[PDB]
Amino acid sequence: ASVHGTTYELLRRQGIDTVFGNPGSNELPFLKDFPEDFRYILALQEACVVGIADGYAQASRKPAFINLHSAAGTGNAMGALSNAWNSHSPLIVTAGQQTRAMIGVEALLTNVDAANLPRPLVKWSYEPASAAEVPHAMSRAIHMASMAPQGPVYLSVPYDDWDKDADPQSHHLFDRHVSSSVRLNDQDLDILVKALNSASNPAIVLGPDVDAANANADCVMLAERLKAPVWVAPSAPRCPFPTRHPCFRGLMPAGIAAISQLLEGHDVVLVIGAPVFRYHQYDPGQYLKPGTRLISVTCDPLEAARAPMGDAIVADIGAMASALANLVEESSRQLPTAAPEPAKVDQDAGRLHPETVFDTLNDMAPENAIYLNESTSTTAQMWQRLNMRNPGSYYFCAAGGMGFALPAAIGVQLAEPERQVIAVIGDGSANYSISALWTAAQYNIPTIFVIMNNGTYGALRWFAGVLEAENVPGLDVPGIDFRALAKGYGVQALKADNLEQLKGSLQEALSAKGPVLIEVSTVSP
Amino acid sequence: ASVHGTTYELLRRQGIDTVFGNPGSNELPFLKDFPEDFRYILALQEACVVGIADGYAQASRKPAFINLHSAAGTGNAMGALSNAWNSHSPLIVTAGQQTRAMIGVEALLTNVDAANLPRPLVKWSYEPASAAEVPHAMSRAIHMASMAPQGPVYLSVPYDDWDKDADPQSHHLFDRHVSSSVRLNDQDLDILVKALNSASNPAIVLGPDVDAANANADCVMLAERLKAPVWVAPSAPRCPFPTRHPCFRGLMPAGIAAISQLLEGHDVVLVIGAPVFRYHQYDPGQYLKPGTRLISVTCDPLEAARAPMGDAIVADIGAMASALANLVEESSRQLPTAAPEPAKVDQDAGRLHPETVFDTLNDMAPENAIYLNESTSTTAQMWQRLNMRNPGSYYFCAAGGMGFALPAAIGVQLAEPERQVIAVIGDGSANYSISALWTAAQYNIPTIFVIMNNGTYGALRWFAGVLEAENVPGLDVPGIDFRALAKGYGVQALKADNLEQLKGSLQEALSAKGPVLIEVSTVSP
Amino acid sequence: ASVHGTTYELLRRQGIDTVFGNPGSNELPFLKDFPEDFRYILALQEACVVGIADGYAQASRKPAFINLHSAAGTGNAMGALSNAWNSHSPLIVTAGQQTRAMIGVEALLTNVDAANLPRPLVKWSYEPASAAEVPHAMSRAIHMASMAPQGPVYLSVPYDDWDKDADPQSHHLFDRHVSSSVRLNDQDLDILVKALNSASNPAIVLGPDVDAANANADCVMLAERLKAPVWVAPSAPRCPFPTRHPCFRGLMPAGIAAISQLLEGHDVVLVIGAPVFRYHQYDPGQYLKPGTRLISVTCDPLEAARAPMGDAIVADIGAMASALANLVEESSRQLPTAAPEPAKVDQDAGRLHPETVFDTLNDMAPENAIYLNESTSTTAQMWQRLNMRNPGSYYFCAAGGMGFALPAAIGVQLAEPERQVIAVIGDGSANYSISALWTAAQYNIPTIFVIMNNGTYGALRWFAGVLEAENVPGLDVPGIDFRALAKGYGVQALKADNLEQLKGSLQEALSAKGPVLIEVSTVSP
Numbered sequence A, B, C: 001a002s003v004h005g006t007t008y009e010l011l012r013r014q015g016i017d018t019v020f021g022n023p024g025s026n027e028l029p030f031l032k033d034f035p036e037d038f039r040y041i042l043a044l045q046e047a048c049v050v051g052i053a054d055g056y057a058q059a060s061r062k063p064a065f066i067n068l069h070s071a072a073g074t075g076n077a078m079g080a081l082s083n084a085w086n087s088h089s090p091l092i093v094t095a096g097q098q099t100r101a102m103i104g105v106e107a108l109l110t111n112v113d114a115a116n117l118p119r120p121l122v123k124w125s126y127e128p129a130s131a132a133e134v135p136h137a138m139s140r141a142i143h144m145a146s147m148a149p150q151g152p153v154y155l156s157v158p159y160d161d162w163d164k165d166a167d168p169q170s171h172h173l174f175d176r177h178v179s180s181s182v183r184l185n186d187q188d189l190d191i192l193v194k195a196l197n198s199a200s201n202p203a204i205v206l207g208p209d210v211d212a213a214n215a216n217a218d219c220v221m222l223a224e225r226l227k228a229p230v231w232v233a234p235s236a237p238r239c240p241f242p243t244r245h246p247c248f249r250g251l252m253p254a255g256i257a258a259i260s261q262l263l264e265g266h267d268v269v270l271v272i273g274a275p276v277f278r279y280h281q282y283d284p285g286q287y288l289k290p291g292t293r294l295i296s297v298t299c300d301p302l303e304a305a306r307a308p309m310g311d312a313i314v315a316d317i318g319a320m321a322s323a324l325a326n327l328v329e330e331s332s333r334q335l336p337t338a339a340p341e342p343a344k345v346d347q348d349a350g351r352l353h354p355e356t357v358f359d360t361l362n363d364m365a366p367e368n369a370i371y372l373n374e375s376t377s378t379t380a381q382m383w384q385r386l387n388m389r390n391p392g393s394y395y396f397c398a399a400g401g402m403g404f405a406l407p408a409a410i411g412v413q414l415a416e417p418e419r420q421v422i423a424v425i426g427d428g429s430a431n432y433s434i435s436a437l438w439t440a441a442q443y444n445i446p447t448i449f450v451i452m453n454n455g456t457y458g459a460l461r462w463f464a465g466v467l468e469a470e471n472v473p474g475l476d477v478p479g480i481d482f483r484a485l486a487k488g489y490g491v492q493a494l495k496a497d498n499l500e501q502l503k504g505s506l507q508e509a510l511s512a513k514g515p516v517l518i519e520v521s522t523v524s525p
């Protein structure tokens, strides 16, 4: 067998059937004779390739496979890799290298010092020392991306390797099963459960690894048994809990003092599946107030090591959430009462307030919609106004890096063809990965893109206010026609300058059979 | 003085007055109170920011200063950095880091292991250990980017550093002058000159560092004195010689055997300002034929070390080209005769052959036009058909990475406001950095963009033919309307479906007062 | 509080009370005012500092703390770090940096690019961005070294940081408890247990992480219930099983084909606490024969990813070994019968055969002796001839790197003051870390060092035979007087040129109250 045949066999035997890619000439010997059981999803720039694969992996809860061109293609994808690192996304990033005979001379298209290029944003990065090693290196990449804590990996392969003979012993790679589905030992788990049962006023804080593990329903059972309020850890990349459940308390503020004030009076705070904590603004004060202790369950040793307070347990989130939910006692405390509905903001017949947009989306979208957020100044309102009952219903760029939501919404829609995806993206953020629209058109992936057009980088005006920073250049983005950009890439486009037109465009988009972009005129900050 | 005030003083005293950027919140404390003597050039994605700065640096022959946001902004720019590394572009890339007090907890927007992120594509990469060190670290960045061999550098700065007090001794940085303008010692230079004077059939091969050094006119004098044919080294990022001078022989084929066959019969081959060599296709055979010896003058030790044949001298290209041109004897051999004009290819009233497009551009463009090339299947025809008499007249992505020419054409036009820039870009390549069009519109930078629309990644069909690779996915890019994309970003747009409309659109574009995009329907390969 | 006071408080609250070090001037501000409850163990070169700390950590099963001088001190220790990486040793390596104000100028003693220096041999490597961050960075180092898979970490600290004020919130670091004591979830564990109960001819292979976890006794119970033969995985750094238990089958040969032939006929092979596998010689063939399947339990994702065959479970070895030993059924198969005693080799009245030395050590040493091995050509005989009943009884350089056993034997003896340590070290290996002898003398740590003096690098003659390599320089080491080297560093020294003198020197050494070196004249290969 050739290295090409053996490597595609390993991929299919490990459950991989889709290649997300933008091709080049070091990759043609891999892509030739492409197997009939695989698909190839082309995107026009590599941030878009990786964003699409990232949405697909996060929504499918399985690894996604990427093929990029050498150093320039890998490099175009590195902002997308920053977000994938912070969302623990299992991405297998492959890139083609020059033929071994010209690597030393640094022929055009040589990826020099290849394994160092995507560091520090990958768990494992490698170029094999011979062609026969390629299937074993691919096996390492698959398992490194997929074991907890999941994350992106990188493999560079000289183009001449594919046609070489494979090692006949590579068949032992095909059916390897590797598990990291582990939980705390019984004695120490019993100690944790007794601490939770004994707490007088527990709180629960949930992060994105809960949604990645599909541990959401176990966390609902846990919060119901403990009768405990539930927040989402700050800077949230995913939604880990039903947002209209009575225990839900919303997104935590991303500040040290704000969080310790929020948690004041809670004797035990159990954090599951989150870093402790993804603060943003600098809000110095106490990490926790006197009387509060914190316990974190995390799948990632790096998160356990860096927490500035609390105890930690490094284990699988699905296995731990299931065990805790089934072992804790039902408290005789009263269940928390649901938060009140948000108020309706006053809306005239002109430009839309973001609050009006989210209320109208909540009124009209299906109950199993999936939302993505890259409208950076409106996140708090989005979390207050969208009822997200089901797992896998929310994604936000985990490293804060623009350029994620537009392509990731296409990958999520490909992973979840029966759930309508609605990406809410600012006019600033929409540009970073605008060419991803083409992939939605070409493959007829029916994502809805709602562009919140207020003419400016609104969140940077907000943060400038926090810093009291004046005379800052580069904050306005006037003069972009998003219906013409959508037409450029083959996507149907609608405009909404007022609430009547917002309702009409959403009705048309929800009834459409392909992707649709709606440009919404929103109020200037 | 504050670190902010001291750092902007150092920049202006070192000749920097423009910041190319896409802002974020770790950068607002640097950008606030932006000095009145500086400009800020916004672009909507970081590949575009860096591409624009790269064109500006290459055309101005001076360092360009960039400010990006943390890891995601730096990462979005890394394919642009791959090209800048291979063009020796002096780029000072700065990125903002979180406040020092939250780096350890990895707050949102922390650039983890920052200095390792852009490696291996930078000459120097650093984050200072204290605020007071920031001006000295910036001084190091300026000089590292600017000394031979020039190239990109990276500096990460915690946002809280800017408002701190500067070291009063930082004033000694402001006027430092650092020179690498060096040439081979007199005794060894005299040995080289005697070898050139004694050659019976010398050849000259020139690379991009000749054009970077503005050594073009000295190389013309050298070739006239030696009566020697002149080629351009393969995979050329720049044009180092007048293309209709009698000595000019064109772009070398990018293959080992093809180059040694071309050079057969030449006893001494002098390479100036090029790697030896940027081969592309694998074309194994002899590096040089018996009877040919090679001497390379390069500004880059890495190029001298990796050449597989020949002697080398590591020195400044401007200083060496001037010395050689003024020291060699005038040979009594006959001057080489000019190559014949290219033939006119047959053209019907339908889609345009690329040969027709380049002939029409050569007929209509000013004699001091500047061309950029990212039309990958038509490079050989472009080099045969455009008379480029002057330095700084051609740029092509030096690492072969798509996404360079569209933004770089805007930076070159900003650097050379009296020379019309004409970027010839394939329909595939145009997508990688499409949002750069917005910067041309907003600042009214009057670049002309000629999009060669043949519906496919034509060069990858070519390379697939070379490999005899069949059943390759992802090679076609149908369904893109480039006039709608140009309208989306505010640029005037024209279409040319035949030769009459090509001539009319070029006349309109050359008479326009702002940027113009022309979509040309070209023949399918 | 100062950073100095807060950092020593964090260390003591996390169970650290000993600093292994060789001092320098960047470290004096850390070491000044050394707390009365800490000890400092000086060694004269940094390979020896780290080797001693490594033996101490491995034997105590807890992290050991090291302080080295800048880049040169760290660099002198990097061969010791290679062994610590492959033994999963929890080492917290700290090094002093220049004062922040002169790092940029690269004053003498600046550790440039410090965090990159010990990579790739550490799990985590860092220099803090401010003085106040130092206690949190130390907390990260402690937990990163101690969480599974354990391993060395590195922290560089500018010397001016120690006297600065600490962050008042650093107290939340002092009592953090972090656990990685996890095992496979109940459903999948029940599947594994049923596979073991159903096997017709199971085998068990154990590696060093069994001894690190003190899982040895649980593995004896497991092998007794399964009635299964037990081997030790190749290139063994530790001894994980009693070597005269009836199930014990010895050290596996370090070859691919040799291992699959050994395992032929075993239907399920359970590997616990080992890489799969640390082969050495290249012995190509099948990884496993038809009819054998392999299951690996490992604490290290990198080991699970790279195994070329089998299933894997990534979990804590102590927790998994305990669960399996208590859940499997007692098989009705007959218990394996003990291997026969090794034969006595013929010994004349001259130089000693290694077999005679190990038989005499086994006859005379206490039953709770601890052995170290750096006598590279005699490993197989050592494993056959020493009855090691107890955990923690054997150490061998895990990366194969010379210079481990001499210093590590001193650290093991410090960790286990009531168990006699006997280091068996070749005359070649003894030189690499010879100055460690001084620390044993100065602190009166009563290690016994048995130097096997055959005048040559015996194992390299063996491997040269395997390669059929002739005319190799550098294999002989004549002319070393080890009793004079021991006298040089203050250690009592004895010579044994025959068996009578070997017995007399061992009796004298076992009765001594301080360290003793015995130089044994062994037969030339």
Ligand SMILES: Cc1ncc(Cn2c(C)c(CCOP(=O)(O)OP(=O)(O)O)sc2=O)c(N)n1
Residues within 6 Å of the ligand: A079, A374, A375, A376, A377, A378, A400, A401, A402, A403, A425, A426, A427, A428, A429, A430, A432, A454, A456, A457, A458, A459, A460, B022, B023, B024, B025, B069, B072, B073, B076
């Ligand atoms: C890759 C990248 N570049 C720049 C930024 C900085 N950035 C920018 C540019 C923001 C403004 C996004 O504007 P928008 O129009 O999408 O939304 P708002 O107007 O609601 O803020 S928010 C933010 O952090 C970033 N985070 N990531």
Ligand SMILES: Cc1ncc(Cn2c(C)c(CCOP(=O)(O)OP(=O)(O)O)sc2=O)c(N)n1
Residues within 6 Å of the ligand: A022, A023, A024, A025, A069, A072, A073, A076, B079, B374, B375, B376, B377, B378, B400, B401, B402, B403, B425, B426, B427, B428, B429, B430, B432, B454, B456, B457, B458, B459, B460
């Ligand atoms: C960043 C990046 N991604 C992909 C490629 C691979 N690539 C691609 C995609 C080419 C086709 C460009 O198509 P075009 O339409 O611009 O021009 P032609 O049709 O004349 O080839 S040429 C080439 O090397 C690349 N070099 N750089």
Ligand SMILES: Cc1ncc(Cn2c(C)c(CCOP(=O)(O)OP(=O)(O)O)sc2=O)c(N)n1
Residues within 6 Å of the ligand: C079, C374, C375, C376, C377, C378, C400, C401, C402, C403, C425, C426, C427, C428, C429, C430, C432, C454, C456, C457, C458, C459, C460
């Ligand atoms: C740091 C280092 N340097 C060199 C070696 C190579 N080496 C050497 C030099 C060996 C010979 C050790 O000789 P010895 O006298 O200690 O024992 P034998 O004579 O029994 O082999 S075995 C071996 O792998 C090594 N592994 N580690």
Ligand SMILES: [Ca+2]
Residues within 6 Å of the ligand: A036, A037, A038
């Ligand atoms: Ca099919």
Ligand SMILES: [Ca+2]
Residues within 6 Å of the ligand: A426, A427, A428, A452, A453, A454, A455, A456, A457, A458
């Ligand atoms: Ca906006």
Ligand SMILES: [Ca+2]
Residues within 6 Å of the ligand: B036, B037, B038
């Ligand atoms: Ca001005």
Ligand SMILES: [Ca+2]
Residues within 6 Å of the ligand: B426, B427, B428, B452, B453, B454, B455, B456, B457, B458
């Ligand atoms: Ca094309």
Ligand SMILES: [Ca+2]
Residues within 6 Å of the ligand: C036, C037, C038
């Ligand atoms: Ca004391």
Ligand SMILES: [Ca+2]
Residues within 6 Å of the ligand: C426, C427, C428, C452, C453, C454, C455, C456, C457, C458
């Ligand atoms: Ca020896």
Ligand code: NA
Residues within 6 Å of the ligand: A116, A117, A118, A119, A120, B116, B117, B118, B119, B120
């Ligand atoms: Na990198």
